[PDB]
């Protein structure tokens, strides 16, 4: 259920949204009181001349309105004023508007004279006073909803920003508690898209879509309330209108869901494919695969273009184009009902009411034009919520015990253990070996017998299906892999350096080793910091891996950072492959000797670096062959050693 999680994240911030809605309620209330001033300015200060008159003095005789400046109690003539065309007429004593010949057939006829222009203006001086009073009233009333609108906007901005921040943090934590397999079998760009290019969809769902929705829904409620205040029969049609919008939100959903989800999936594919191309651009620019990679991309691009054009029609019969059809149907009703009321001359009551409704229609549709402009984003962000939420709601996750344990003896042990990726490729079979503090080296020439499989089984990157691994008699299935992985360190077979200074790469953003860990670099690095112009702390290698640095130098930095951390078990993976230069490879094994202080697992395809190991394994085809030392060489390792020399 996507909506429930959106509601829960919103309820995490109740104070912010409730205060914003209250302030906006105040603002909309002020604005909706606004047009009553127009109503009551019309009906009073323009149509008061049309009501009975018992001070206004033209010709020096005519008395003043019943309710007007200079009101003694006096009534002798009961005069009236009537409207004919663009001319007004004044009848002295006690219908139709036929022209000193005024007739009201409903019959009696009387005489009236034209009110000219200056005399007509003379009438509405008190009306001028009333106009300026009401005008100033509304002008002042505006500046109160001026500081309420500001407040509610600046409050919704924080509610949206906080919501998106919280959601992003939760997603990132969840992805870091995912098994390695999940990352193994999914493109980096694909996962990266679901975090950065996918939460942006949900951010806009909050920053503009839902904020605009609540504002418009607060504006419409007020407008319908005012419409009910004025009329109760036309307000019932007004209420009927909203089910229309509901049916406008249901249809745009039964017609956009599939294509929006296809667009999102293609976008993820396009992020993944572009990442892959950037990473391996040397094989594109050295093997002339440029045109084929362009063709694949263009296939994806045209698929996305096609689906967008598979949505180019639904959005065309919607939006303002369709908001104008409700507006004109509102005008038609405001004509028809008033006409059916005024057929028998019973339409002069609603002359300020007519104006108020006319103003109200202008009010109502702009909130609606706001609402419709987001249905494209709403149905687009529903997809994004599902993709992100499925990631956030995932049951194959592994609970992680963050606390790291203390130092442990270097006791590794392996019982009858049978590991197999994807349940079919039985990499390891009945692997059993032990170590206390010496160098136990796993050797195989098969190149696919599962050396790295054993190493990543030790870290529980993948869970074994048979047997158990016990360090100091501690089954690795005690979870808390942060203690399991803090006792021991690994130099990956393919190093990955992070961004920032080489000193930062060795330190790894940990607050354990001071600046004087140059010893780790000086442990095996010869004159490279001298070669490069500035020391470790002032040269920033090219972002990601150090393409500004050689593969061996990168591997040197990786090994140094492995030693910078001091592990109870030092695991290595072809740690001396690209730095095989013997001048420095001998300094890593002569001046940086493993010594007894570490329990080291030295993996390598060269017999030179494992000649002094006190335990050598073969593990060929996932099965061990030899358990002796270097001098215990009869048949198999003899072949490998002989060819090396």
């Amino acid at each position: 259920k996507i909506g429930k999680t959106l509601w829960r994240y919103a309820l995490l911030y109740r104070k912010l949204l409730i205060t914003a809605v209250l302030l906006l309620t105040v603002a909309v209330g002020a604005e909706l009181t606004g047009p009553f001033i127009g109503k009551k300015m019309i009906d009073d200060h323009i149509l008061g001349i049309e009501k009975t008159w018992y001070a206004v003095q033209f010709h020096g005789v005519s008395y003043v309105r019943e309710d007007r400046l200079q009101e003694p109690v006096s009534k002798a003539k009961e005069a009236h004023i009537y409207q004919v065309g663009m001319a007004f007429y004044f009848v002295d004593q006690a219908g139709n508007r036929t022209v000193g010949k005024l007739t009201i057939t409903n019959s009696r006829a009387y005489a009236a004279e034209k009110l000219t222009k200056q005399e007509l203006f003379q009438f509405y001086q008190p009306e001028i006073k009333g106009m300026v009073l009401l005008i100033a009233l509304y002008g002042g009333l505006l500046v109160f909803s001026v500081f309420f609108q500001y407040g509610q906007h600046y409050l919704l901005q924080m509610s949206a920003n906080r919501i998106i921040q919280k959601m992003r943090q939760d997603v990132f934590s969840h992805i870091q508690k995912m098994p390695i397999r999940y990352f193994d079998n999914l493109p980096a760009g694909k996962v990266v898209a679901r975090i950065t290019n996918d939460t942006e969809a949900i951010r806009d769902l909050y920053v503009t879509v839902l904020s605009t929705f609540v504002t418009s829904g607060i504006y419409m409620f007020g407008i319908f309330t005012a419409l009910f205040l004025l009329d109760v029969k036309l307000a019932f049609v007004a209420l009927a209108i909203v089910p229309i919008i509901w049916l406008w939100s249901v249809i745009y959903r039964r017609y956009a869901s599939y294509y929006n989800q296809k667009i999102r999936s293609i976008n993820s594919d396009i992020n993944a494919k572009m990442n892959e191309s950037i990473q391996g651009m040397t094989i594109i620019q050295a093997f002339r695969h440029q045109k084929e990679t362009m063709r694949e991309f263009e296939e994806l691009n045209e698929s996305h273009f096609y689906f967008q054009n598979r949505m180019l029609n639904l959005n065309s019969l919607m939006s303002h184009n369709l908001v104008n059809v409700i507006r004109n149907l509102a005008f038609v009703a405001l004509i028809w009902h008033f006409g059916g009321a005024s057929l028998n001359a019973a339409g002069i009551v609603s002359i300020g009411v007519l104006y108020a409704f006319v103003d109200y229609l202008n009010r109502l549709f702009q909130p609606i034009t706001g609402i419709v402009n987001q249905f494209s984003k709403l149905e687009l962000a529903r997809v994004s919520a599902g993709r992100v939420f499925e990631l956030l709601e995932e049951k194959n996750t592994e609970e992680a015990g963050e606390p790291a344990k203390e130092r442990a003896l270097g006791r590794v042990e392996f019982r009858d253990v049978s590991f197999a990726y994807q349940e079919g490729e039985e990499v390891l079979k009945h692997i059993s070996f032990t170590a206390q503090k010496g160098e136990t080296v796993a050797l195989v020439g098969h190149t696919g017998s599962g050396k790295s499989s054993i190493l990543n089984l030790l870290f529980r990157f993948y869970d074994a299906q048979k047997g158990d691994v016990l360090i100091d008699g501690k089954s690795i299935y005690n979870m808390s892999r942060q203690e399991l992985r803090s006792h021991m360190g690994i130099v990956l077979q393919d190093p990955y350096l992070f961004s920032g200074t080489i000193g930062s790469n060795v330190s790894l953003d940990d607050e354990r080793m001071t600046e004087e860990e140059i010893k780790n670099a000086l442990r095996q690095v010869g004159a490279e910091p001298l070669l490069k112009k500035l020391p470790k702390g002032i040269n920033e290698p090219v972002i990601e891996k150090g393409s500004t640095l050689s593969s061996g130098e990168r591997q040197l930095i990786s090994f140094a950072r492995a030693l910078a951390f001091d592990p109870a078990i030092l695991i290595l993976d072809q740690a001396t492959a690209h730095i095989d230069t013997e001048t420095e490879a001998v300094i890593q094994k002569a001046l940086d000797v493993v010594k007894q202080g570490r329990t080291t697992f030295v993996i390598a395809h060269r017999l030179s670096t494992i000649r002094n190991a006190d335990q050598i394994l073969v593990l060929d085809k996932g099965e061990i062959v030899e358990r002796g030392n270097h001098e215990e060489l009869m048949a198999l390792e003899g072949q490998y050693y002989q060819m090396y020399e």
Partner: protein, 574 residues
Amino acid sequence: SVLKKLGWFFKAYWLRYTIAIVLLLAVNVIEMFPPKLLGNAIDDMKAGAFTAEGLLFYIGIFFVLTAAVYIMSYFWMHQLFGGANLMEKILRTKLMGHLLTMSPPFYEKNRTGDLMARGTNDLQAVSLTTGFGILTLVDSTMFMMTIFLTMGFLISWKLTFAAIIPLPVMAIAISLYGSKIHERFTEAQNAFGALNDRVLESVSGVRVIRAYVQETNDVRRFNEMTADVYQKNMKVAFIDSLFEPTVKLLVGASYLIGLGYGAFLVFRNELTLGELVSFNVYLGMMIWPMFAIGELINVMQRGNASLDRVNETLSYETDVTDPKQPADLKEPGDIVFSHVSFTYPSSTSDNLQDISFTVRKGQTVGIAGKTGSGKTTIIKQLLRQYPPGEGSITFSGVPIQQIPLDRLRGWIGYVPQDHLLFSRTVKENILYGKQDATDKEVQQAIAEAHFEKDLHMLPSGLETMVGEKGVALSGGQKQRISIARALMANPEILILDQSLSAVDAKTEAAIIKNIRENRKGKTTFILTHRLSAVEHADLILVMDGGVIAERGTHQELLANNGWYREQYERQQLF
């Protein structure tokens, strides 16, 4: 600016939007008659002249006008929203066309997440701007223009130069708001690039993170960055919420001035209640839609900043790597280095000094010395991935340049010291080299790098999927796929870059034995640290810093005292 930057698209298609401007004029005028029609109808109602046939005429006009606007603005919506899609697609194609055909010295200055976002996010922003922002801008501008004209002639010019007084203030406010929002949005786009960069780094480095237990120490950094992004989002929320109140204020001021001064005009008898209603409806349609003005500027400045990013990345001069004038000489077998003083872009020293290297016809040459001595620098001189400062590859007489990068790149074999693959099957990524290879040469290269046995371990020989990067493959297997792939091409020039450092000695023997069989009279560049495959060559250059310490074959090196002299014996006594 965003208009001056996006115009060339419109100049390319001025048959699709010219038809749509006339269409919008038509739908605006026809939908702008009903105001005056209503004013007239209510004037008739007040005078008591409202007759039945007038009601029928009014409702018929309203219905026909509604249908006309419906269809004739449906066409305008379709056209413009399709133009936006086309703009986005063509920009994406141009962007990937510029990312390719560009040498590696730009990827050190340009990020993989900044560029990935600069494609996806920047183009979606530009699409949203091209469609919706231009739609709203043109529609609103012309609508306001015509409403100001109709109220002028058709109602009055005093009532309409008077609610116009507050609009200059709107203009200045809209100037300042855009002036700030442009900078804010360029910063936001760069920030999204940075966020994508950080997430990409975290995802790529996971085992290095998990093996070191720094999940928490990374969630800390992400949280701090998100907090800073929130702070920026609120430094813009402040300005956006200080802008809207001035907008609504001025809208209300225009409304109030129009209403009050129109009532006063009615008092002077220069206007009627019907005309008052008409003017008020005109103002209601004209100035109240300005509530979305802020969103319009948001879209329009976000698009401008995104397109500025795309433009500055889309014209970089592609380094110095380009055929000047095709010399059109098929490869001479001679590669004679005269004087090569090279300096990487990100360096301040001559990484390579004058090297008089020379390799004739087909001769394996061995380059192996202290790490960091720039042997892969000399190799990169051949591939011309970097600008030539003083390099003189001098193929026969002609310098390195004046050759087709297609043909020159076809001459070279490969330079993958770090392993690289692609997400596909092993067959497909072996086919990735040369022109899709052939039928059985795939199996030839397979059982020519001693890789046939490996297929037993792989459950689906040549058919099992190779996971992203090296997943589903061991390190030696991946290098053995690289050698097979790049031996599919049978190159005239082959460059091996520590190509034997990820497999055992036993398989190393098979490769060198099979490389000896494969390479007979074809020049090969052997770079390695296992000092046994370098034994056979016409020349062996030992590299020390920016200069070659010694030159000769495998014999005189063991005679002259130097680096090679001590390195062979130690690897021999083992």
